[PDB]
Amino acid sequence: MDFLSNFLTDFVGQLQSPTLAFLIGGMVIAALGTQLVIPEAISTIIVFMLLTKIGLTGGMAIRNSNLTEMLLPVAFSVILGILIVFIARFTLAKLPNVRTVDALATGGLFGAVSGSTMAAALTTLEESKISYEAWAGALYPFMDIPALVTAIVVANIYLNKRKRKSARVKIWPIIEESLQGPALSAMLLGLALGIFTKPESVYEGFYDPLFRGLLSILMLIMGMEAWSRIGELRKVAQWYVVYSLIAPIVHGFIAFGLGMIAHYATGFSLGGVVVLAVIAASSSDISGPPTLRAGIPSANPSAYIGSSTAIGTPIAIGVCIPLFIGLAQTLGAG
Amino acid sequence: MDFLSNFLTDFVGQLQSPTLAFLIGGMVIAALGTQLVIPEAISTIIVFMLLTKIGLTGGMAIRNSNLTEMLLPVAFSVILGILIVFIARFTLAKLPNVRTVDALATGGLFGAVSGSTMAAALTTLEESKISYEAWAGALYPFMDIPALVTAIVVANIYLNKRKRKSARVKIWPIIEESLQGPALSAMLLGLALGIFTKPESVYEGFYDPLFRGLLSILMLIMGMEAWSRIGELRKVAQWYVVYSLIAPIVHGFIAFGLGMIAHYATGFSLGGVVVLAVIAASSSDISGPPTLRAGIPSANPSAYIGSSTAIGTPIAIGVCIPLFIGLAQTLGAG
Amino acid sequence: MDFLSNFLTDFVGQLQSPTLAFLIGGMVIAALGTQLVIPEAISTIIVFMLLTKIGLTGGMAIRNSNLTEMLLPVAFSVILGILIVFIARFTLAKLPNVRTVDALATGGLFGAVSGSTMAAALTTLEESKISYEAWAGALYPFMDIPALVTAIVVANIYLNKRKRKSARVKIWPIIEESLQGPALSAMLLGLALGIFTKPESVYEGFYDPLFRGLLSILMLIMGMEAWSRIGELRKVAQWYVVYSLIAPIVHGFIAFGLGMIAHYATGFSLGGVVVLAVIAASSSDISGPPTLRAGIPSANPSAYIGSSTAIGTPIAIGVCIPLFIGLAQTLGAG
Amino acid sequence: AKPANKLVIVTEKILLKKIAKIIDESGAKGYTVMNTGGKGSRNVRSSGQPNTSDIEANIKFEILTETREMAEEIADRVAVKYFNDYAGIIYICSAEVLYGHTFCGPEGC
Amino acid sequence: AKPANKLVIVTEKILLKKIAKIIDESGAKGYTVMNTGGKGSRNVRSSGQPNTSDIEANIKFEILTETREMAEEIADRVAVKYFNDYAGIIYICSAEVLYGHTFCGPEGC
Amino acid sequence: AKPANKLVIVTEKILLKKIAKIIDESGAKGYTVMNTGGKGSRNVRSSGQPNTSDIEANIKFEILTETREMAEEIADRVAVKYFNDYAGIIYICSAEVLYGHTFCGPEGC
């Protein structure tokens, strides 16, 4: 009722803010040429030390708090990450010209989460003065690991009964290879240094001040990395453009209400529900497509990378972070 | 009259300040060996995000101001950038052992503007408490683009009538290749994000605090990049040492007084006149010599790079930024 | 007497602090895999601009002070750096299965210092509110250069009388190659810019704020670079594990008391004695290696690198920086 | 000058550890890998980092084998296992190894 | 093992897109470029970035062509067009392409 | 197509200036060096920077010499002087230099 009112004045205020302004600013210059490039050594130390901040601010507010409250949101993400790939197995794969191996790999990437679309939400939640739960940054590995592993298993149980029955996946080295990769071992280090040590002299002074600044450099990369794959999903069928444009809206609604069971059962933050939504509505595109290419080699990389970079991440930040902040700002306090 | 008084006490105070102290500090260590090197990934993110600050502080103070005042200084730079290459065509090229193709390419770089000699002036103008005009950083593309394009056209109209008449330049892909290059598309992004969006939470906090710090790393590179070409203009004739040592003084005097027409015609800042001088006296050496090597391939790169790096940029910062601050501090307010 | 009391409560408070927490945090993740890597372009600009801060804060407090006080500590380090390699020549080399060429090269690195193990002491001295002498950072050159040069000379005077007598070192290009290397010409630049210029607007604002933050990134590299060589000293004999685990304790005791002659003879800081102990108990592992491989090519690099990275630097920071802060906090003021 | 065969494998970057296992298990004395860029009409290159900073996105192995039948044993366990789904090209050149210890032996070449 | 010719072009870095147009227009199936450093008595190397961070300042193409007459067609449209004003060297080696799809065809090598 | 010999030296990174002195003193017209990574059972690689950021830790020279006896003169002054204590491998391939000025001469190839 009051929701279209507090979206359209919130979509504009999102678009004025530098966490989206540099994303569409990065797509505009990359559409015009621009031999400007941010080098790989800078992009690595910006994905690190942005997830170390998310880890340190999650580890500090997880040792002085009773960890009974965490039981519902870390179980509502394991369920939800497995749920996304089965939605793509019964909705996306059942179109006329689309392969099942690609549609499981596209839904595998949307099931995961990306730290770019996530850290864009953690600033915007505390820019609009909504007190979110601080350990919700530590909810990143859940619904990243069970979503990529239930796209490799399901694609093999499809591909076995096509050549063995019609014409075995080791479950641990999938999840002990994605766990000790970059951008996740940066945060698990940041968690364990917050639970056990006291890094409060280096958090406030290095990791917290240049967090919103380095996020803007990182949002500029993701805009240029979105235009570089916009000509790649014009190689596969037209239903991926429909999926990647609607599935951030659908996966977050069945993340919001599935996370509205919290703060009705155990005391949850209600600014953590919108964090749990933006993490469900965002698709992985840095740590994701290394897997689902060693795990699902028979898939088309132009079909799942071109959907989660070009259309998945700008819509998860443009029309989805203000879609769930305002809906949480309407339904309750903000 | 009072000008030699307020130069010699201003040249020393320039030389104590870190925006020149690291330049001569960078030449001293590079003269002594020093396998110290600042890598290319760090030098790229320092030329970016120093020109993004110049863009953001120019774009913020261009939307809340009537843009009638800009008409004289952005036309006095297009005239002046074309003027520099014709001065080198009738003064530098008319020496006994010098080629016309090289002298047009040497004057092509001095017409252009480098962001190193420019951002060194924008700090020193607000270190000596002289209120400069904030959009004068957006005057960078003018007198960078018409100066490089009127050195490629004039060198071809010389080289045509030497083999066709004695023994055609496509004007747009010269200026749509220098425009979407790095260090200029970094600033045009910074302009458009200042006019249209509101990046005031990331400007004060990331781009403004570590501006004067990253400038000192960048001045250290330019000192080491000046000693690496000091043995290169000992390969061409001795008149390039005379040109590159006098032309920053001459090109700025006919930039100061040509910009003294402003704040007599339309209200201009008088701390923007010295910004318009240091931009006219400075010579490009990062974005410049990619062009005038694809545009003028028959020139000697040892003749125009060795003059604008080794002698052009240390003199444009050492004896030229305090030469025009004090002259603006004498003639009027400071 | 009161020393085991003020060690065990100081070893824990060291281990909570991020200058050791990221070191053991870096070894734990590297023991578990972690394709996380900090790139070489970031590691170079962190070793630079951490030693520029040590240089600038040493150069500022060396021009307004009478430099008679410096005569004893800069002579007590030249004596001590030559002393370490002779201790390894008469203690480490006289074991059953150990080569003299390797034992001189292992003691050559322990003689030298390490900016990473020294930057960790300069924060912890001003974290526990102990007023250390500011020019003691300028003590890095001494006991780095005479320790590496008295391991190359002594190894050649051993290796000459084995093939010429049984079966010449140019002394200047050893010390004019280590002097104009990186991580030392970064600090000598920082000294000369502090003595002569006034970089107080760029020191407080760029080099001092993100000093303790970049140190934590650098301590994370040194932990991962310690686990990468922990499987390398299992290739040489077991007495290197004994040497590298005891020699940081022994070399600092005969640095503390040898530096206790100061502030009894000339007025020294007593927080500079613990700085002179840690600079003496640390090893090279970054600059030392390049030398003692061009200088002593017949040595085993698995024997001296594997001792000063894997066991030398974690013990010099874990059990040696709180060992000498508390001993200086017991014996006198803290 | 012991005559050898330079096997060259030019594939995607994400097969760095996987083909280096195939080289080590085949009995070759070693390899030499470097990061290259290319163009071959199968150009996608996931690679782990973002796309715009992929100046080099391939890897190029160079394996010097003593016999021809080992170089086609390495090249066959790669093209069967990876090149049906990944990018790549394999070719053999000729070379005479002058110096080296693991390839000559203690007697020399 | 389809016999091929490895054309190698080692030129300045600023000719990255320009020679890659010549390779694509000539009908070669692809190229492999990498960043190298060198020394050839024409050493200036503008290159876009500052000079001291030019550890590598050249580029090295490697084009495998099916016939000799295509490799000297690529090499001739470069040396006429660029090597009168730019640095460079071109040489042909010999190779036998074992695997690959665009170079063998669907029948294989 | 002037017939040449491609001498390739693949050694540790810290011998960058030292072998480049040997190449310049031998009378070769130039070299081409690039940073590679490898595996050869003498893998320590001090290299100056820390170990974990040593994605590439070797260097690879490629020297085109006019005569065979110069290429084995360069290769002999390296293996005697450095390969008794350092890592390395040297091999000669064959090549026909098509273009270039310092290698052909003004008359061309």
Ligand SMILES: Nc1ncnc2c1ncn2[C@@H]1O[C@H](COP(=O)(O)O)[C@@H](O)[C@H]1O
């Ligand atoms: N004819 C060729 N010459 C040189 N390199 C090639 C050739 N064909 C393919 N490549 C390289 O092989 C890799 C894979 O190409 P492709 O598998 O054909 O897409 C890329 O690095 C290409 O540059």
Ligand SMILES: Nc1ncnc2c1ncn2[C@@H]1O[C@H](COP(=O)(O)O)[C@@H](O)[C@H]1O
């Ligand atoms: N004889 C040679 N062997 C190997 N590389 C060479 C040779 N001559 C020139 N080059 C390379 O060719 C490029 C241009 O050299 P030049 O055009 O001779 O200045 C540089 O990358 C050199 O390293």
Ligand SMILES: Nc1ncnc2c1ncn2[C@@H]1O[C@H](COP(=O)(O)O)[C@@H](O)[C@H]1O
């Ligand atoms: N058989 C081989 N093929 C290719 N490269 C090799 C071979 N043997 C050694 N290398 C390279 O030679 C260098 C030194 O190896 P080594 O001296 O054998 O430890 C390393 O860069 C290795 O990758």
Ligand code: NA
């Ligand atoms: Na998701």
Ligand code: NA
């Ligand atoms: Na100019």
Ligand code: NA
């Ligand atoms: Na020491």
